C-alpha cells in the first residue's frame, strides 16, 4: 500500500460542534458599503453597528460555525445565520463595551447599543 509519510487515517463519523446548546436563526443585513466578516466567537450583539438585525437576539450568543471560521457579508448583502449560546460564565468584557458583565443584563446591553447607534435595537 502506497505510503504517504505522516498521513492520517481518520475514524468514521462526524463531529457535532456546540452540542446541546440552543440554536437560533436570524436574518442579518450589511447596510454598509464595505464588506464585514464576523468570527465564530465574537459576542454577536457587539458586531459592527451597520449590520442590521434584531440586536436582542444576538445577546449571550455567537455564530454556530466551526471554531476559527467566519461569516462574510458583502456590502448590501442580507442573509440568514445560525447562532449558538455562549458558554462558561456567560460574561462578556471589552469588544465593543456593550456588556462588560453578565450577558443576562439585556436591558442595559440594549440601552448602550441604541445610544451608540448599533442598528436594530428593537
Amino acid at each position: 500500500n502506497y505510503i504517504v509519510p505522516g498521513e492520517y487515517r481518520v475514524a468514521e463519523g462526524e463531529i457535532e460542534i456546540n452540542a446541546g446548546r440552543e440554536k437560533t436563526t436570524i436574518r442579518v443585513s450589511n447596510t454598509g458599503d464595505r464588506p464585514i466578516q464576523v468570527g465564530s466567537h465574537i459576542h454577536f450583539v457587539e458586531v459592527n453597528k451597520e449590520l442590521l438585525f434584531d440586536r436582542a437576539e444576538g445577546i449571550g450568543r455567537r455564530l454556530n460555525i466551526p471554531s476559527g471560521t467566519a461569516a462574510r457579508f458583502e456590502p448590501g448583502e442580507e442573509m440568514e445565520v445560525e447562532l449558538t449560546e455562549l458558554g462558561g460564565n456567560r460574561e462578556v468584557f471589552g469588544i465593543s463595551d456593550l456588556t462588560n458583565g453578565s450577558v443576562d443584563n439585556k436591558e442595559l446591553i440594549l440601552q448602550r447599543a441604541k445610544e451608540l447607534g448599533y442598528k436594530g435595537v428593537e
Partner: protein, 100 residues
C-alpha cells in the same frame, strides 16, 4: 562581490540542486530535500533570467514529476517558496503542489 547574508545562504540551495541533478542523471529516484533543492533553484534561476512570477508559478509544476521521485515525495511537498531578485526587485514565488 559584497555578499549579504541571504546571498551566502542561497548559494547552498544552488549547491544542493547541482548535487541532486547529478543524482537524477545517474538514474536515481530523488528524495525530499533533493526535489525541494531542485525546484527552488529552478525558481531562483528563472527570476535571474527575467521570467515573471506568474510564469514561474506555472513552470515550477512541471520541473519534476512523480516518476522522478521516491514514493511519498509528491505528497510531502505541499508547496515550495523562494524569494529572488527579479528585474523589478525581490519577489516571493510560491509553487503549490509542484510534483504530480
Amino acid at each position: 562581490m559584497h555578499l549579504n547574508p541571504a546571498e551566502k545562504e542561497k548559494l547552498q540551495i544552488f549547491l544542493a540542486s547541482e548535487l541532486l541533478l547529478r543524482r537524477k542523471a545517474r538514474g536515481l529516484k530523488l528524495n525530499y530535500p533533493e526535489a525541494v533543492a531542485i525546484i527552488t533553484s529552478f525558481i531562483m534561476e528563472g527570476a535571474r533570467d527575467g521570467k515573471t512570477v506568474a510564469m514561474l508559478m506555472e513552470e515550477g509544476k512541471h520541473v519534476l514529476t512523480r516518476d522522478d521521485v521516491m514514493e511519498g515525495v509528491p505528497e510531502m511537498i505541499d508547496d515550495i517558496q523562494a524569494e529572488a531578485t527579479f528585474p523589478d526587485g525581490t519577489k516571493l514565488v510560491t509553487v503549490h503542489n509542484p510534483i504530480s
